[PDB]
Amino acid sequence: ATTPLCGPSRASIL
């Protein structure tokens, strides 16, 4: 539904 995510970033969980 949004661009698929292959690179989980540390910033993204804040």
Add this chain to the structure above:
Amino acid sequence: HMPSFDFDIPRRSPQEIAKGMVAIPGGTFRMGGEDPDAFPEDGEGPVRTVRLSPFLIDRYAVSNRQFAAFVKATGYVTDAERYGWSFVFHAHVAPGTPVMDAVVPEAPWWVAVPGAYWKAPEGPGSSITDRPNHPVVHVSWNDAVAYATWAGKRLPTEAEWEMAARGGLDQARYPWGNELTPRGRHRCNIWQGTFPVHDTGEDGYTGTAPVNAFAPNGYGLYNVAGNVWEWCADWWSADWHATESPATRIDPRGPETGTARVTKGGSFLCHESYCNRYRVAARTCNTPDSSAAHTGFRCAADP
């Protein structure tokens, strides 16, 4: 980029640095992709002719054994160790392993696991004793640059990575051609089955494979597609390379500033029905102190 290190750079000979590397001669190649199913946000296009200076590139992604030697020689502490956690795919977290409640937006299959790092890739209790020849993972971009500099090397640019990964073919879909499994043979370690629920392991592996698994490409490089995402030197953007200029077409280095560094090549998790990012033109990014169980790197060098 100007890194800071806590170890001296050892003196190395040219023949030492070149061991396990392939010499890529200078020349042109057609970089990028225009697959109509490509996600626009990824900026796979435009296809363009890029000229590169000669360079060396590792046949193999850096292995656990090699990273352990770097740590032993330097005392290097990886970003995942400083943070105290790293990302592990949910299917590989042993039941009862302490986990953070953190959720990656839009990717709930990633688990932030305290104590997961390169030597314990699934968290406390796991080890790499049986994976000495597997690619090192839970290494951030910073860790990769630290290793490469110690080794007398550097990260490849995205253009160097793609020229080497294409292995002498002109605008093929994969490193080896246009068929995913020519003659019914698996050529890379990606996902089979139903992502993210069940990996059938039809290609032999439901996690990382040894760095020398599968046939190499035409230049002798192993697992440029699949196995682990590979850090490149460039800052990420989706459109810097749309400009037609010497800076974008002759030894291009990417934009001068950014927030995430480019990763190439796909991993054991990639699948046509989710990301479709194991095509050689594919690209994504991650922030430079981030680390994950499916991301490693290979080095490049100037001859």
